[PDB]
Amino acid sequence: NAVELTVDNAWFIAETIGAGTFPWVLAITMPYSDAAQRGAFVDRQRDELTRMGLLSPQGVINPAVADWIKVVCFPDRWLDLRYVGPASADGACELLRGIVALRTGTGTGNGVVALRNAQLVTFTAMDIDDPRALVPILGVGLAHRPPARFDEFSLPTRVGARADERLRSGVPLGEVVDYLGIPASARPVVESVFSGPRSYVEIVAGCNRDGRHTTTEVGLSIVDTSAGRVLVSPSRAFDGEWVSTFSPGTPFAIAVAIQTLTACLPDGQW
């Protein structure tokens, strides 16, 4: 029900199903530039898939595998998973990205999960409409942790975004925190969320109604701090201003947040 491939393997399969690109989040971009390179690339890929038994002698890719990749490249509903982490002590960051794709039209498989780490990507076919299987998937990128404990607090989303920008541009952390205007109780958590190591997963949802693709204007973050996991979920207030809520990152809380996040879409997810 799962397969692990190199990004190059995956790209070749994507060409096979006529996909212009992979979803942006994955960062699986065309690996070659010219006719000469393509030929070499194709030769290499055909031999490799073949050695793996992915490519049959008749020249066809395992339809199940090809289909999964078709779902990832042409999703009706999806969740992007952008993992962010403290760079390794080698001066570099490796890529850890994911997408949760579900397809419709006829209602083995319900949806496909693609997770890309460095030069490899794995595709897993599963029922993604269950939070007891879906929520765990999100965490693999994250360091294993328990939900942090604190009283929930909120702040306008615009304010939060601006603070992050200021912080990233050199405004010192204390000053930025003062800018937030949150309660003293809240301060320890926000500092954990904003500063230091800075390690999390950012999630955005999307859907493809008719031929129009729409994505959420906002996304949630599952952050992990020294204190524990912190969930930053957005909601719109009565006056319509966006508000961000920092709550303990329990599985239930994360699951409800995802459901609410999807709710905004015209016809997306469940």
Nearest CA among 200, 202, 178 for reference residue 191: 178
Preceding residues of all breaks in the chain (C to N beyond 2.5 angstroms)?
Answer: 107
Query: Whole-angstrom Cα distance, residue 79 to residue 260?
Result: 13
Radius of gyration from C-alpha coordinates of the chain: 21
Query: Whole-angstrom Cα distance, residue 201 to residue 97?
Result: 9
Nearest CA among 183, 160, 152, 156 for reference residue 247: 152
- Report which residue type is found at 247: S
> Residue 254 corresponds to which tokens in the numbers above?
């994360």
| Residue 198 CB neighbour total at 10 angstroms | 16
Nearest CA among 178, 51, 69, 55 for reference residue 113: 69
**Could you tell me if 26 and 148 are in contact, meaning their C-beta atoms sit under 8 angstroms apart?**
no
Nearest CA among 67, 97, 93, 64 for reference residue 79: 97
**Could you tell me if 199 and 261 are in contact, meaning their C-beta atoms sit under 8 angstroms apart?**
no
In terms of C-beta distances under 8 Å and separation of at least 24 residues, what long-range contacts does 51-54 make, across chains too? 54/3, 54/9
> Residue 73 corresponds to which tokens in the numbers above?
């490249």
Q: In Å, what resolution does this model reach?
A: 2.4
Whole-angstrom CA distances from 57 to 47, 49, 51, 54 are: 10, 10, 10, 10
Whole-angstrom CA distances from 44 to 16, 32, 59, 135, 177 are: 15, 12, 14, 37, 53
Query: Whole-angstrom Cα distance, residue 50 to residue 62?
Result: 11
Give Cα 89 distance to the centre of its chain: 24
Q: Would you kindly state where each structural domain of the chain is located, as residue ranges?
A: 1-270
Secondary structure of the chain as H, E, C letters? CEEEEEHHHHHHHHHHCCCCCCCHHHCCCCCCCCHHHHHHHHHHHHHHHHHCCCECCCCCECHHHHHHHHHHHCCCEEEEEEEECCCCCCCCCCCEEEEEEECCCCCCCCEEEEEEECCEEEEEEECCCCHHHHHHHHHCCCCCCCECCCCCEEEEHHHHHHHHHHHHCCCCHHHHHHHHCCCCCCHHHHHHHHCCCCCEEEEEEEEEECCEEEECCCCEEEEECCCCEEEEEEEECCCCCEEEEEEECCHHHHHHHHHHHHHCCCCCCC
* Burial of 187: CB neighbours in 10 Å, binned 0-12, 13-18, 19+: middle
* Burial of 108: CB neighbours in 10 Å, binned 0-12, 13-18, 19+: exposed
Q: Is 53 left (phi over 0), alpha (psi -120 to 50) or beta?
A: left
Residue 87 φ/ψ, nearest 5 degrees? -65, 145
SS3 240: coil
Residues 6+ apart with CB under 8 A from 129: 102, 110, 111, 270
Terminal-residue alpha carbon distance, the chain: 22
Nearest CA among 243, 65, 227 for reference residue 160: 243
